[PDB]
Amino acid sequence: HMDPGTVLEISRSLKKRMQDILKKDNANNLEGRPATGKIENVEEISDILMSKALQESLLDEGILDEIKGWLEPLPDKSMPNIKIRKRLLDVLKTMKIHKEHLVTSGVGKIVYFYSINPKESKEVRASAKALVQKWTNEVFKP
Amino acid sequence: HMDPGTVLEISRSLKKRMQDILKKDNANNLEGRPATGKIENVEEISDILMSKALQESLLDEGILDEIKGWLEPLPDKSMPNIKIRKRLLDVLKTMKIHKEHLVTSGVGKIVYFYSINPKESKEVRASAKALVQKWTNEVFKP
Numbered sequence: 001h002m003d004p005g006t007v008l009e010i011s012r013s014l015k016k017r018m019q020d021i022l023k024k025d026n027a028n029n030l031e032g033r034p035a036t037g038k039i040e041n042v043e044e045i046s047d048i049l050m051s052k053a054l055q056e057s058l059l060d061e062g063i064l065d066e067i068k069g070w071l072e073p074l075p076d077k078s079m080p081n082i083k084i085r086k087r088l089l090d091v092l093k094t095m096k097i098h099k100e101h102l103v104t105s106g107v108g109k110i111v112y113f114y115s116i117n118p119k120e121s122k123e124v125r126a127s128a129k130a131l132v133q134k135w136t137n138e139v140f141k142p
Numbered sequence: 143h144m145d146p147g148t149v150l151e152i153s154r155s156l157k158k159r160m161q162d163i164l165k166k167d168n169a170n171n172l173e174g175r176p177a178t179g180k181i182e183n184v185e186e187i188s189d190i191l192m193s194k195a196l197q198e199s200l201l202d203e204g205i206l207d208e209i210k211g212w213l214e215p216l217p218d219k220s221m222p223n224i225k226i227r228k229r230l231l232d233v234l235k236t237m238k239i240h241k242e243h244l245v246t247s248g249v250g251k252i253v254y255f256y257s258i259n260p261k262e263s264k265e266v267r268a269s270a271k272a273l274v275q276k277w278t279n280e281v282f283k284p
């Protein structure tokens with residue numbers, strides 16, 4: 001009932017939107033100023049990233065690189081706001097992420113960092129460990 | 143296939159996106175800067191406005207108001223680029239627009255103007271006349 005061309009178009013559009021917001025936030029950080037792009041769009045974007053109809057296309061289109069980039073340090077090396085870090089981990093957790101996606105994305109690297117990062121809340125560190133445990137299970141299960 | 147929550151979220155998202163681009167282009171025009179938001183997004187936004195899965199929600203959510211907004215004059219009274227005018231008319235004609243929709247949106251007013259505007263191409267006046275004919279037929283059949 002949604003055409004495969006439409007699912008693809010919307011997945012691509014979401015990808016490009018995550019990239020534009022990332023790049024605008026990073027450029028603002030480099031101008032000594034607040035990045036508000038991600039915080040203003042994370043709920044709505046997270047909601048859509050978790051659409052079960054869209055996930056397979058989003059995953060196949062490398063959406064994990066954008067999620068990754070949103071979890072990464074800004075130019076001044078501060079971290080994205082805690083609501084973003086929490087919400088995007090909650091997105092990775094509910095997505096049907098399998099071995100193929102990890103071996104291709106680098107996301108497991110940023111997530112792993114969160115799990116052992118001493119500046120991170122026990123809550124987030126915990127949730128990143130859970131993700132790590134789950135993804136170890138994907139990668140290695142018979 | 144797609145949950146009704148997600149359909150409604152994508153429709154609202156597209157609505158606010160058309161509004162934001164319109165207001166940004168209108169504020170650029172008033173400054174003396176070329177308006178490029180609409181031209182850079184009309185193909186992709188058009189493509190999605192024509193999604194059959196989304197149309198009923200988009201229409202119910204008043205998307206005709208935004209389409210109307212994009213067809214009307216900039217602050218200096220010049221018209222949006224011809225590619226936008228042609229593409230949004232093509233969107234209106236393939237979209238399943240009925241009596242209720244017009245009744246509440248004012249888009250029929252902007253289309254009627256295009257049909258009688260002497261500053262407008264023959265092909266554009268023609269397609270707007272066709273739309274008017276079709277909408278007169280919608281409004282009036284038993």
Ligand SMILES: [Cl-]
Pocket residue numbers: 035038039079080081084
């Ligand atoms: Cl941030």
Ligand SMILES: [Cl-]
Pocket residue numbers: 177180181221222223226
């Ligand atoms: Cl324009």
